[PDB]
Design a protein around this nucleic acid. Structure first.
Lengths: 182, 461, 374, 535, 166
RNA sequence: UUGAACAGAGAGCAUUUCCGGCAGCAGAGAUUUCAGCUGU
């Protein structure tokens, strides 16, 4: 912590007060900084599900390469994860080990969907807006940031009517019709 | 009810003026300081590891060496940094070891210069100028002993005819030389051992036991009138110069390459011989060595004492040198180099801190006697830390984890393989002598310290 | 740390000082915490000679309290144990440490010397010699240390040989201040006066002269003149002959004013041949000084030396029998001066008349003296 | 040289249950001289000790000491100590587990709800206030105020000086008790799992996982002397643990029911354990005797603590009660609650206090000051306990006035001399010695030759066989115990000559029985068989 | 053995006493070469025993010319005779470390019991006391040493060139 | 290599040669300390 001299750094090399090997390079912290994750245990709650997908993918690739059970369940899991939005392509089954990843499950969260739909300028702005209760999917208002938005369910991410944000974008283009409140 | 709490008062513990240091109150309760064995065990382990990373013993070679391998070296016992070395091609050189550069070189002889030493020549017509001239004399196999003077810049008192002030002459070759430490005298071994003085151009006396030649010579350092010599009939002969005669000899198994006398004990000497170990002998009883220093793997070429008399240095024909504590009998340290071949001469500088080795590729190299020890002057905090760590390594010396670290060196491949086949050979002969002793009746238990003397004139009662 | 070493060097004396039942443990802990404060202030950074001085004063105060408590408790004046010299040894070592750290304040060096001298029989005069040797080594140019060293070894020990060696070594180092010259002629006159008084005393119960003082007087004039002509006109001799003669005149004025002070404090040594010992300085000043003190300017100084040579027998009391013996000498002096001088003639006449009138029934013999010097 | 307080500075040694070597004799004589000189000179430092311990003394027989009020102490003592006696009223988060740094400079409080605050309690400087909205249980500093570890809902987290999270430990699954071992740099963790985990803070490496095998860990304390961990279980069992042995070093039966709290003296000699059976028990640690058994407390003691000067602070809910000189051998030091008729041989409380609103969560003495910090349901309260702190600290072990540079260099130096976790034994002085195997006399190789000689001649001398002796009640004759302890199926030459020597023993016992009963005379030793020998 | 040290400087003469010898054989090594830069270790080698200051700039210029052309002046004679012990002239002279190999003969011409050393050990001892300067002297001189250096350099140069202000 | 007288250093080593005991008395410096004679 004091920038050890040469004899000290030679004499105690494995000493590190910040980065440990159980930390795994602080990647929970790293991807929760990237996608602005509030609570500490969401990374590991997603890591359990990525481990489920990859455990099944291992145990399913250990079946013989031609039997219809392996082919049906590999294709069925691939279709389910593409439809949910974690996987970005349902083509190859090496996605079920390589491209299945806590960052993919985190890119499917509601503020990241928002920021990619240009509905907020950054992920922290999207977090603030859906905490303030501006965003509804479908009819019903969504209030928490961790909400996972599937591919067919991202067509209905809008703002609530009577939103001040909806009002100011309509009045920026002065398409505001005050009959329907905005 | 009377009542009293701890009044810390902050004037005694954090100082008023900012320029001065904080008070460090002490309290020597073992309750306050709990892990007193483990804490100094770990300090002794960190001291052994710090020594094994601070061991940088090679100081530097001096000059450019010689052309044909260094076979003779002599320090002068009155100046700290001056060193004379001679090679196989007859050139001798005088060295300032401070700047690592020669005062002068000399094409001294034509053959090998087989011996050289240094003198303060007591002429009784001239007066020796030892503050500006140094004197080295040197014998070779072309039947000559020559005495040279050197211009020396050590005092600036004065302001001059440097080389070859005289040329002693023998009829046969010479093989060793050493100068008496007083009274203008030296001795040369060769086909026979003669005594000389620097005034007369001929030997004063021939002091030879028999008609068997003499390979090496050393004068004593205190009780200066006792000589010792090594003859090629595996013999070690002592001479006395009061009686002007030999004194006693012993015959060993193999040939003694060198002697050095203990400068602090005046009757002990160490021989360095061709079975690969050194023998610490008492002059008053040559029937047993009082130590054997065993760790070399080829023939030991030269030995020397520390001027403190507490350790010896020992260079051998396996291309490595070894430093030995005098009371132990195994090597405290080994110095080697891929560039160093066949170390033929080793001296221990009068500082007792550096070790001069002359190899046979040509080079003369300085080493530290203590490898981890630096030569700056030390403040009392670092001096106290260093001697605390020395005492701590001393009292934890035999713990297995720090013993395996302090014992560790990198030895060359050839010396390591010779060492392990030497181990399995010695273990095999111990197995076979244990079997033979189990059967046979009267097998005497000969000591290791007696196992190398085949005989002794003037038997002991 | 070294405060720890010094503090636990302080413990055997209070072992002994608790065993001898004068101090208790709770008060010796108080003197140890005060001494801890002082030792830490001594051997930490930012140290001061006032820290040393306050430690010495505290140790002397606890020594005086220890002596008082010993006389009141044990009713002896020393316990002849460790605890009656250890504290004075501590004070001496605080002084030695302070003079090794700050060897620049002569106040502290002289406090060291005063305490070491006043320690009495228990100290050693070679221990005072050692600190005199190192103080004179560090300050060779400061001259009062040479005077104090020689004064201690003559006015206490009466060691004439070593005192002469001290004065000659000091005059080797700084042969430029006249104060060391005057104290050397003072020492030589005191030594020759004690010599002739022990001769007079051995006569009254039962060769070697002031020529030593005259020879050191002569080399005093020569070397003080040399050092003033080398001190002023400092760098070079870039000065024309007007400035060279102005300089040489001024060095004559300087040197002759110092010899005026020499005779002025020379007269009071009246137990040796004071007439001879003043007349030799008179004849040493009477000769030529290479720039015509008589035959040119410093004629006022020539008149001053003539007045001194006139009254050099008339240095007497109002009982003027010497005046009635040799006032004709003063009359011939005034005649020989007024035979040459022009305004110094009237000046010397009026001055000798005023001097004799000021210095000299009894008014009727003084009426004869007034008629003589009228 | 005599030194009335030497036996504090003395040092025990090995004994067998003199020499002919001259050099070794004089070496041992120099060693004994040096040990005596070192003990004497080390014990003469008590003059140099600056401060004096605190106290309070009754000076009357009507003036009892347990009925002295904290406001009366705060009036009677100085303004600096009265300002150290702090009180934080933090009402909304839960009961506050208190923790002090090992010099008393920093305070670390944890609410049960989420509120963890690390602060300099004696200035007004807090340096971490973090609200971790899951239920935190405990915290500790590591080697400094610069890092602290908190035991959260499940995982133990490690935070830096200003409160940023450094580590989430994926092991240490449900901690309830954390304690740092400062000379070894080990964070020790126990809780609702039956596991004890030692985690190296410097390297970052989980050193040990040990099955307690006794359910959740109810209490936990550290011996400051030898760094072994005393855990208290729901059996009424304390067990002493080291990170080398996967079994407890010792298991003591302290209480009935569970063990609510454990405290150890800093000398490593006494241990006070409170059980849930309303029983405080004072234990000798070194010899494992039970010194005192104060049974039938009025309500179960929820905490114990032992100061640096040996006070005993027990807490039973609202009440805190301190006894002085209770950790001693004699029965007159058994802590009582009243003196029945004024008995001087009854250890009444040294002082007591009642936290009338609440139930105290934990106790901790402030290290070098005369205070007891108790954390309770509405925050923190320091109590001025005058006998309760080492007045004379050592400033190079741990310094309450230490600066930023001193903290930096002391951190690097203690990190450099960190003791390995394998050196933790029940006694600290057992890592210089020799094995308790490997015979106590060193061997001179003559006797090694002798040992290999009788190992060669174990056959035909039967030195590895029990000796034949007839009169030893041959149902327990040694040779038949050999024959029965061996497996009854294999046949080796060793057991064959034991069977031979056993038949020899039975025949000698037969003839001795016969000449004792009188059926045969003396020898008559088979006058025909003596002739038939040579065949 | 390098027992005493003579440092000449514009304020006067200094005699130092060598406490600890530096290494002779390891004199080119890194730690020995930078211990004369560190002051905390140089004060383990050198201790000041005497400093005779000059009488002014006139005696300063006289002694600067005498030191320049390698002669022992009278102030040198005084301070050396005060400080150096009366050793023998035939057996174990006292050893003075100078920086001027042609000032050495003038020192032995006046004190035959003094052998003078100016080789690389005395040279780096001398440049150690030159590198530290005012710190070794413990406060005992009047006048800043660089201000006296400016005055003495200008005086020496104008003397050597015979600078006339006419 | 020894001897002689001389000049010294404070840098070593003994031992019972005296003192660090008491007064009477004069002396010394700034009311405390300092310096010698006649006996205990």
């Amino acid at each position: 912590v004091r920038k050890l001299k040469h004899h000290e750094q030679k004499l105690l090399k494995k000493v590190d007060f910040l980065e440990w090997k159980q930390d795994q390079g602080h990647r929970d912290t790293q991807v929760m900084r990237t996608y602005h994750i509030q609570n500490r245990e969401d990374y590991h709650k997603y890591n359990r599900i990525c481990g489920d997908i990859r455990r099944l993918a291992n145990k399913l690739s250990l079946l013989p390469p031609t039997d219809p059970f392996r082919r049906k369940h590999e294709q069925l899991l691939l279709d389910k994860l593409y439809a949910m939005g974690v996987l970005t392509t349902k083509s190859k089954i090496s996605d079920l080990e390589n491209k299945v990843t806590v960052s993919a499950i985190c890119r499917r969260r509601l503020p990241v969907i928002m920021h990619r739909l240009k509905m907020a300028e950054t992920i922290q702005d999207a977090v603030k807006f859906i905490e303030q209760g501006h965003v509804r999917v479908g009819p019903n208002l969504i209030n928490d940031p961790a909400y996972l938005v599937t591919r067919n369910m991202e067509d209905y991410v809008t703002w609530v009517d009577n939103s001040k944000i909806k009002k100011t974008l309509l009045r920026y283009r002065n398409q505001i019709d005050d009959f329907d409140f905005s | 009810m009377k009542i009293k709490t701890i009044k810390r008062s902050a004037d005694d513990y954090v100082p008023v003026k900012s320029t001065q240091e904080s008070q460090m109150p002490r309290n020597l309760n073992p309750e306050l300081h709990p892990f007193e064995r483990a804490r100094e065990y770990t300090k002794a382990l960190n001291a052994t590891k710090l020594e094994r990373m601070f061991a940088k013993p090679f100081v530097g070679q001096l000059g450019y060496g010689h052309r044909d391998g260094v076979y003779a070296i002599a320090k002068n016992y009155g100046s700290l940094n001056k060193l004379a070395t001679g090679s196989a091609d007859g050139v001798i050189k005088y060295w300032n070891m401070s700047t690592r550069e020669e005062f002068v070189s000399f094409k001294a002889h034509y053959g090998l210069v087989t011996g050289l030493c240094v003198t303060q020549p007591r002429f009784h017509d001239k007066k020796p100028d030892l503050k500006s001239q140094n004197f080295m004399l040197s014998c070779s196999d072309d039947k000559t002993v020559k005495l040279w003077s050197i211009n020396v810049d050590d005092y600036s008192n004065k302001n001059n005819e440097e080389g070859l002030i005289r040329t002693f002459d023998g009829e046969s070759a010479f093989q060793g030389i050493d100068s008496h430490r007083e009274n203008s005298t030296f001795a040369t071994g060769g086909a026979k051992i003669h005594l000389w003085d620097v005034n007369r151009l001929k030997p004063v006396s021939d002091l030879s036991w028999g008609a068997d030649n003499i390979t090496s010579l050393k004068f004593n350092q205190n009780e200066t009138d006792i000589l010792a010599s090594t003859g090629s009939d595996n013999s070690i002969v002592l001479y006395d110069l009061r009686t002007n005669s030999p004194t006693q000899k012993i015959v060993q198994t193999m040939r003694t390459n060198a002697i050095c006398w203990n400068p602090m004990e005046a009757f002990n000497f160490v021989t360095a011989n061709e079975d690969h170990n050194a023998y610490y002998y008492d002059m008053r009883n040559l029937s047993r060595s009082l130590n054997v220093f065993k760790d070399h793997v080829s023939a030991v070429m030269d030995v020397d004492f520390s001027p403190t008399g507490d350790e010896i240095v020992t260079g051998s024909y396996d291309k490595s040198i070894r430093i030995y504590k005098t009371n132990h009998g195994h090597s405290r340290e080994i110095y080697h180099t891929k560039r160093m071949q066949h170390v033929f001469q080793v001296k221990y500088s009068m500082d007792s801190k550096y070790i001069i080795s002359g190899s046979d590729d040509g080079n003369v190299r300085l080493w530290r006697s203590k490898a981890w020890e630096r030569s700056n002057v030390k403040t009392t905090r670092e001096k106290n830390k260093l001697e605390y760590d020395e005492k701590l390594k001393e009292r934890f010396r035999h713990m297995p984890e720090i013993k395996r670290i302090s014992r560790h060196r990198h030895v060359p491949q050839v010396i390591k393989k010779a060492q392990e086949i030497k181990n399995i050979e010695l273990s095999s002969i111990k197995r076979r002598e244990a079997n033979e002793r189990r059967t046979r009746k009267d097998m005497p238990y000969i000591s290791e310290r007696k196992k190398q003397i085949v005989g002794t004139v003037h038997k002991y009662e | 740390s070294k405060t720890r070493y010094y503090l636990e060097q302080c413990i055997p004396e209070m072992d002994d000082l608790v065993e001898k039942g004068l101090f208790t443990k709770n008060e010796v802990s108080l003197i140890m915490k005060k001494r801890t404060d002082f030792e830490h202030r001594l051997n930490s950074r930012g140290s001061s000679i006032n820290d040393y001085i306050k430690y010495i004063n505290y140790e002397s105060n606890v020594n005086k309290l220890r002596a008082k408590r010993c006389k009141r408790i044990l009713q002896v004046k020393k316990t002849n144990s460790l605890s009656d010299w250890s504290i004075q040894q501590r004070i001496g070592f605080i002084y030695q440490r302070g003079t090794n750290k700050f060897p620049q304040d002569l106040k502290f060096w002289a406090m060291y010397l005063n305490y070491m001298k006043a320690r009495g029989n228990q100290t050693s005069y070679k221990k005072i010699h050692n600190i005199y040797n190192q103080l004179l080594k560090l300050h060779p140019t400061n001259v009062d240390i040479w005077i104090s060293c020689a004064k201690y070894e003559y006015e206490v020990h009466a060691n004439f040989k070593s005192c002469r060696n001290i004065f000659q070594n000091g005059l080797r180092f700084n042969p430029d201040v006249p104060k060391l010259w005057y104290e050397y002629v003072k020492f030589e006159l005191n030594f020759i006066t004690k010599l002739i008084n022990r001769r007079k005393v051995m006569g009254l119960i039962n060769a070697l002269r002031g020529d030593i003082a005259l020879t050191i007087f002569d080399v005093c004039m020569k070397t003080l003149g040399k050092h003033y002509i080398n001190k002023h006109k400092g760098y070079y001799a870039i000065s024309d002959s007007k400035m060279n003669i102005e300089l040489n005149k001024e060095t004559l004025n300087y040197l002759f004013s110092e010899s005026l002070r020499y005779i002025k404090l020379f007269d009071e040594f009246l137990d040796l041949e004071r007439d001879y010992l003043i007349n030799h300085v008179l004849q040493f000043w009477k000769n030529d000084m290479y720039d015509l003190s008589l035959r040119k300017d410093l004629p006022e100084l020539y008149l001053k030396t003539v007045m001194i040579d006139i009254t050099l027998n008339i240095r007497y009391m109002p009982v003027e029998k010497l005046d009635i013996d040799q006032l004709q000498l003063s009359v011939k002096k005034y005649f020989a001066y007024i035979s040459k001088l022009d305004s110094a003639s009237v000046k010397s006449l009026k001055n000798e008349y005023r001097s004799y009138l000021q210095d000299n029934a009894e008014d009727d013999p003084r009426y004869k003296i007034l008629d003589l010097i009228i | 040289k005599e030194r009335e307080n030497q036996n504090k500075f003395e040092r025990s040694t090995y004994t067998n249950n003199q020499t002919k070597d001259k050099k070794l004799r004089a070496g041992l004589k120099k060693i004994d001289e040096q040990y005596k000189k070192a003990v004497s000179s080390a014990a003469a430092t008590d003059y140099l000790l600056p401060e004096s311990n605190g106290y309070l003394e009754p000076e009357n027989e009507l003036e009892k000491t347990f009925k002295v009020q904290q406001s009366e102490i705060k009036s009677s003592v100085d303004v600096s100590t009265a300002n150290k006696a702090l009180d934080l009223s933090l009402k909304e988060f839960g009961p506050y587990h208190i923790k002090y740094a090992k010099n008393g400079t920093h305070l670390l409080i944890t609410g049960r709800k989420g509120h963890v605050a690390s602060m300099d309690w004696r200035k007004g400087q807090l340096r971490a206030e973090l609200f971790l909205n899951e239920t935190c249980h405990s915290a500790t500093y590591l080697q400094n105020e610069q890092y602290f570890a908190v035991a959260q809902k499940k995982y133990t987290f490690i935070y830096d000086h200003e409160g940023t999270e450094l580590h989430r430990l994926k092991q240490h699954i449900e901690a309830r008790h954390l304690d740092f071992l400062p000379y070894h740099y080990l964070l020790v963790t126990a809780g609702e799992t039956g596991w004890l985990k030692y985690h190296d803070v410097s390297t970052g490496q989980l050193v040990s996982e040990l099955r307690t095998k006794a359910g959740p860990t109810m209490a936990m304390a550290q011996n400051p002397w030898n760094a072994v961990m005393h855990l208290g279980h729901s059996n009424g069992t304390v067990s002493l643990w080291s990170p080398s042995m996967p079994e407890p070093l010792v298991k003591l039966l302290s209480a009935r029911g569970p063990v609510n709290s454990i405290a150890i003296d800093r000398s490593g000699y006494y241990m006070a354990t409170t059980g849930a059976d309303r029983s405080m028990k004072i234990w000798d640690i070194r010899n494992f005797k039970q010194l005192h058994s104060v049974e039938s407390l009025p309500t179960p003691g929820t905490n114990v603590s032992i100061s640096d000067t040996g006070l005993l602070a027990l807490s039973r809910g609202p009440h805190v009660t301190l006894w002085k000189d209770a950790l001693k051998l004699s029965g007159d030091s058994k802590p009582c609650f009243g003196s029945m008729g004024g008995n001087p041989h009854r250890n009444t409380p040294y002082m007591s206090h009642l936290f009338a609103g609440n139930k105290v969560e934990n106790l901790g003495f402030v290290p070098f000051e005369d205070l007891l910090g108790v954390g309770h349901q509405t925050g923190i309260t320091n109590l001025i306990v005058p006998g309760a702190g080492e007045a004379n600290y050592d400033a190079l072990e741990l310094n309450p006035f230490e600066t930023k540079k001193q903290r930096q260099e002391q951190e690097v130096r203690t990190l450099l001399n960190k003791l390995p976790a394998d050196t933790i034994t029940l006694d600290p002085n057992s890592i210089g010695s020799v094995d308790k195997r490997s015979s106590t006399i060193r061997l001179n190789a003559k006797d090694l030759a002798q040992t290999t000689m009788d190992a060669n001649n174990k056959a035909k001398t039967n030195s590895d066989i029990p000796d034949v002796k007839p009169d030893v009640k041959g149902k327990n004759s040694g040779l038949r115990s050999f024959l029965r302890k061996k497996t009854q199926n294999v046949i080796d030459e060793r057991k064959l000559r034991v069977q031979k020597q056993l038949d020899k023993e039975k025949n000698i016992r037969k003839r001795n029985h016969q000449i004792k009963q009188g059926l045969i005379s003396e020898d008559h030793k088979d006058v025909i068989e003596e002739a038939l020998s040579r065949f | 053995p390098i027992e005493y040290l003579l440092f000449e400087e514009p304020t006067g003469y200094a005699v130092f006493k060598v406490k600890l010898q530096q290494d002779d054989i390891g004199s080119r090594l890194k730690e020995v070469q930078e211990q004369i830069n560190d002051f905390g270790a140089f004060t383990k080698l050198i201790e000041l025993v005497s400093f005779a200051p000059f009488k002014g700039a006139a005696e300063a210029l006289e002694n600067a010319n005498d030191i320049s052309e390698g002669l022992v002046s009278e102030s040198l004679k005084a301070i050396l005779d005060l400080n150096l012990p009366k050793a023998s002239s035939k057996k174990k002279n006292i050893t003075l470390a100078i920086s001027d190999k042609n000032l050495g003969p003038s020192i032995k011409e006046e004190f035959p019991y003094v052998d003078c050393i100016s080789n690389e050990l005395a040279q780096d001892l001398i440049r150690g006391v030159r590198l530290h300067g005012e710190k070794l002297f413990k406060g005992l001189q009047s006048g800043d040493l660089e201000r006296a250096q400016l005055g003495l350099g200008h005086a020496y140069s104008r003397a050597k060139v015979k600078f006339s202000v006419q």
